[PDB]
């Protein structure tokens, strides 16, 4: 079974806001795990997310992805580590019940229905390769087979097909993020994809515009590895697709290594570094649809990497400029994109920056869960300061801009310049053509652009400020402030491109 081309077209417009449920908004102070991995209140729940949908929608996002919300049943006598694990949802017991520390089944149904009203898709987190030891049998009487971690395929396939279809039929969720997807063999992903596509076409709901639609059936694999492994374990071969979308970890690293440093300190790369990462998409088969995120619940926050690398701090202007540069790269990236909660306000963990190794789990400070900080949602859990609001407004402008210009979400990309100081892409989709330019240097600069090299015949219009740029002797001259990005509409493209 090939990938569905209608879904691929729809997937390019996904602007996904990721929510780690336990550490997000404590909306019902009567329920919650109260322990976990991270420094948050550990009492996030479905009411908190429900209270946050309007905020999320005004960001410009059109989807939410929740970490697993299914029932992780406590085993009598289990140690404190097993209580913390239960709060993550990643080692569950009952795939067919909502964990009562997060809420009820009725509240889940209310969450999805309300998100659908406000114009948001909903994705759940499917862990189909491992589970807690006390896993509970399915409604149709199935159980997964083999070890708890990993389970055996194909014996466990009937069980996980039942999981994947249950929440689509019951709540009409729009798809699945697929945890540690290399644990499930590619053969089985095709079969689970068939069930999801079938389950999704067998139910409908009314979207925010009155239209009755099927749930999307989106599926995106999490494979924390490089391009050859994402290809081998996730996308599959040319002509023989396994999954159709995986997270773009390689380009995520290029971004933070250009505009900050990664968890290991590799940093201060330039525009050439971004461009080489995008060119490595050639290693994927033609059906592959990578999904670019900047961070997630397993990665240190951008803001803390800036501080870790001694690059910038929230008091300094470069800290905010560098956030905007990275977020602008994402907004220009063709394909689905995902934003981890708090990136839109440059969140960081006060008093933390350097890596903490010894005894880090109990302090909530290991690199793989330190981003699970309590959600600062403006108007709900926090009043933002002027710099946080300025960044959130900018993320809104990017997402609104992206929703309006096909060249950003599904454009063909052609690189114009990639050097130590600037990165300039040409994006074209139908007759929407624009130039994306971002500075990768702390110095101000002027960019010379030959009108013929970018297939431009008329003017360039800054899509955010409105400034017209006119060519003189066949050249545009644009000034770039340090780490400043501009989206320039090619107002009258040439005969071809
Ligand atoms: O004490 C051991 C270990 O516990 C914690 O690790 C857990 C993660 O916090 C938890 O989320 C889950 O990890 C999953 C990832 O989040 C998920 O994105 C996927 O890609 O991989 C994991 C499989 O679900 O489970 C791990 C433990 O297995 C804590 O964060 C660690 O520091 C600690 O070492
Ligand atoms: Ca709560
Ligand atoms: Ca910090």
Among residues 383, 411, 439, which one ends one of the domains?
A: 411
Are residues 469 and 348 located together in one domain of the fold?
no
Q: Are residues 308 and 213 in the same domain?
A: yes
Residue 347: HSE in the Cβ half-sphere, 13 Å Cα cutoff: 24
The reply to whether ligand 1 has any atom less than 6 angstroms from the CB of 367 is no
Closest ligand to residue 313's CA: 3
- Give 369 Cα–ligand 3 centroid separation in angstroms: 14
Which of 72, 224, 298, 357 for a ligand 1 pocket mutation test, highest count of atoms within 8 Å of Cβ? 298
Rounded alpha-carbon distances, angstroms, from residue 149 to 132, 152, 370: 8, 9, 24
| Nearest CA owner, ligand 1 atom 27 | 85
Overall residue count recorded for the chain in this entry: 497
Same domain? 330 vs 465: no
Residues in Cβ contact with 105 at an 8 Å cutoff, skipping those fewer than 6 apart: 97, 98
Domain match, 368 and 426 both: no
Q: Which two tokens stand for residue 6?
A: 């209608």
Same domain, 439 and 392: no
Shared domain check, 248 and 377: yes
233 lines ligand 1 (CB under 6 A): no
What residues contact 356, with CB distance under 8 A and at least 6 apart?
Answer: 363, 365, 366, 370
Alpha carbons 247 and 145: distance in angstroms, whole number:
28
Q: How far apart are CA 81 and CA 44, in angstroms?
A: 19
Residues near ion ligand 3 (CB < 5 Å) are 304, 307, 348-349, 352-353
In whole angstroms, what is the distance from residue 232 CA to residue 281 CA?
Answer: 14
| Same domain, residue pair 257 and 118 | yes
| Nearest alpha-carbon partner for 355 in 291, 468, 286, 263 | 263
Inter-CA distances, 113 with 55, 116, 124, 207, 287, Å: 16, 5, 14, 9, 31
CA of 360, closest atom in ligand 1: 32
**Residue 298 Cβ < 6 Å to ligand 1:** yes
Ligand sitting nearest the alpha carbon of 365: 1
| Structural biology method used | X-ray
Q: At what angle do helices 249-259 and 271-279 cross, to 10 degrees?
A: 180
What separation in Å is there between the alpha carbon of 10 and the centre of ligand 1?
A: 31
Of the candidates 35, 178, 50, the residue with the CA atom closest to the CA atom of residue 104: 50
How many angstroms does the Cα of residue 52 sit away from the middle of ligand 2?
14
Q: Show the CA angle centred on residue 98, arms to residues 97 and 103, nearest 5°.
A: 150
Q: DSSP state, 372? A: -
- Last-in-domain residue among 376, 411, 446: 411
* Residue at token pair 């060519």: 471
C-alpha 479 – ligand 2 centre gap (Å): 49
Residue reference for tokens 């067998």: 202
Task: State how beta strands 205-206 and 94-98 pair.
Answer: unpaired
Q: Which of 151, 297, 368 to mutate to test the pocket of ligand 1 (most atoms within 8 A of CB)?
A: 368
Hey, what are 407's tokens? 């060249």
CB of residue 83 inside a 6 A radius of ligand 1: no
Looking at the fold, whether 364 and 421 belong to one and the same domain comes out as no
Q: What is the number of structural domains in the chain?
A: 2
Ligand closest to CA 27: 2
Ligand 1 close to Cβ of residue 368 (< 6 A): yes
Nearest CA to ligand 1 atom 12: 90
Together in a domain, 202 and 78: yes
> Ligand 1: does its nearest atom lie under 6 Å from the Cβ of 81?
yes
Contact 402, 434 (CB under 8 A): no
Which conformational region is residue 419 in: left (phi greater than 0), alpha (psi within -120 to 50 degrees), or beta?
beta
Q: Which ligand is nearest to the CA of 247?
A: 1
Report the separation in Å between the CA atom of 309 and the middle of ligand 3, taken as the mean of its atom positions.
11
> What are the residue ranges of helices labelled H in 290-335?
302-308, 317-331
- Residue whose CA lies nearest to ligand 1 atom number 3: 361
Q: Are the C-beta atoms of 236 and 242 separated by less than 8 Å? A: yes
* CA 479 – ligand 1 centroid, Å: 45
Question: DSSP characters for 123-138?
Answer: EEEE--S---TTPPPP
Rounded Cα distance, 399 and 331, in Å = 7
Q: Which residues contact 316 (CB under 8 A, 6 or more apart)?
A: none
Q: Looking at the structure, tell me whether residues 441 and 377 fall in a common domain.
A: no
Enclosing domain of residue 484: 412-497
Shared domain check, 445 and 326:
no
Of 381, 411, 441, the position where a domain reaches its end is 411
Residue 264 Cα to ligand 1 midpoint, Å, equals 19
Residue of 369, 372, 373 with the most ligand 1 atoms within 8 Å of its CB, for mutation = 369
The DSSP string of 27-40 is --TT------SSSS
Residue 201 in contact with residue 110, Cβ under 8 Å? Answer: no
Q: 390 with 459, same domain?
A: no
d(CA 350, ligand 3 centre) in Å: 4
């Amino acid at each position: 079974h090939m990938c569905d081309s209608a879904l691929t077209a729809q997937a390019n417009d996904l602007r996904i806001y990721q929510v780690m449920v336990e550490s997000f908004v404590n909306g019902d102070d009567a329920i919650g795990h109260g322990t976990g991995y991270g420094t948050s209140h550990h009492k996030g729940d479905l009411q908190g997310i429900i209270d946050s949908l309007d905020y999320i929608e005004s960001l410009g996002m059109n989807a939410i992805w929740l970490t697993p919300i299914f029932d992780s049943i406590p085993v009598e006598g289990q140690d404190h580590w097993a209580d913390r694990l239960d709060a993550t949802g990643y080692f569950t017991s009952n795939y067919f019940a909502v964990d009562p520390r997060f809420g009820t089944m009725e509240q889940a149904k209310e969450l999805v229905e309300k998100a659908h009203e406000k114009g948001l898709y909903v994705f759940f987190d499917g862990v189909f390769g491992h589970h807690k030891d006390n896993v509970v049998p399915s409604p149709e009487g199935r159980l997964p087979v083999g070890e708890n971690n990993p389970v055996s395929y194909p014996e466990s396939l009937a069980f996980y097909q039942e999981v994947a279809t249950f929440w689509i039929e019951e709540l009409k969720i729009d798809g699945w993020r697929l945890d540690q997807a290399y644990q499930v063999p590619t053969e089985a992903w095709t079969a689970i994809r068939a069930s999801v596509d079938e389950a999704s076409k067998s139910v409908t709901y009314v979207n925010s515009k009155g239209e009755a639609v099927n749930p999307l059936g989106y599926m995106v694999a999490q494979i924390w590895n490089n391009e050859n492994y994402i290809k081998e374990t996730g996308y599959g071969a040319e002509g023989e697709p396994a999954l159709c979308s995986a997270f773009d970890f390689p380009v995520r690293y290029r971004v933070v290594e250009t505009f900050a440093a990664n968890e290991n300190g590799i940093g201060n790369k330039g525009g050439k570094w971004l461009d080489e990462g995008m060119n490595l998409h050639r290693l994927y088969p033609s059906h592959a649809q990578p999904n670019l995120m900047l961070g997630n619940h397993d990665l240190v926050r951008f803001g803390d990497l800036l501080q870790r690398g001694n690059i910038a701090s929230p008091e300094q202007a470069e800290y905010w400029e560098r956030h905007k540069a990275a977020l602008s790269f994402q907004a220009a990236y063709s394909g689905p994109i995902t934003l981890y909660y708090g990136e839109e306000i440059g969140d960081e963990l006060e008093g933390y920056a350097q890596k903490v190794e010894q005894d880090c789990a109990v302090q909530g400070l290991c690199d793989d869960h330190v981003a699970r900080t309590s959600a600062n949602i403006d108007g709900l859990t926090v009043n933002l300061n002027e710099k946080q609001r300025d960044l959130k407004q900018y993320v809104s402008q990017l997402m609104t801009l992206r929703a309006a210009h096909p060249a950003l979400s599904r454009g063909e990309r052609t690189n114009i310049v990639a050097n130590e100081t600037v990165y300039i892409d040409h994006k074209q989709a139908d007759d929407d053509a624009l130039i994306y330019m971002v500075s990768t240097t702390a110095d101000q600069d002027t960019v010379e652009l030959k009108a013929s090299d970018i297939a431009s015949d008329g003017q360039l219009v800054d899509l955010l400020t409105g400034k017209v740029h006119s060519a003189i002797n066949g050249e545009y001259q644009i000034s770039l402030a340090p780490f400043e990005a501009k989206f320039l509409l090619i107002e009258t493209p040439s005969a071809s491109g």
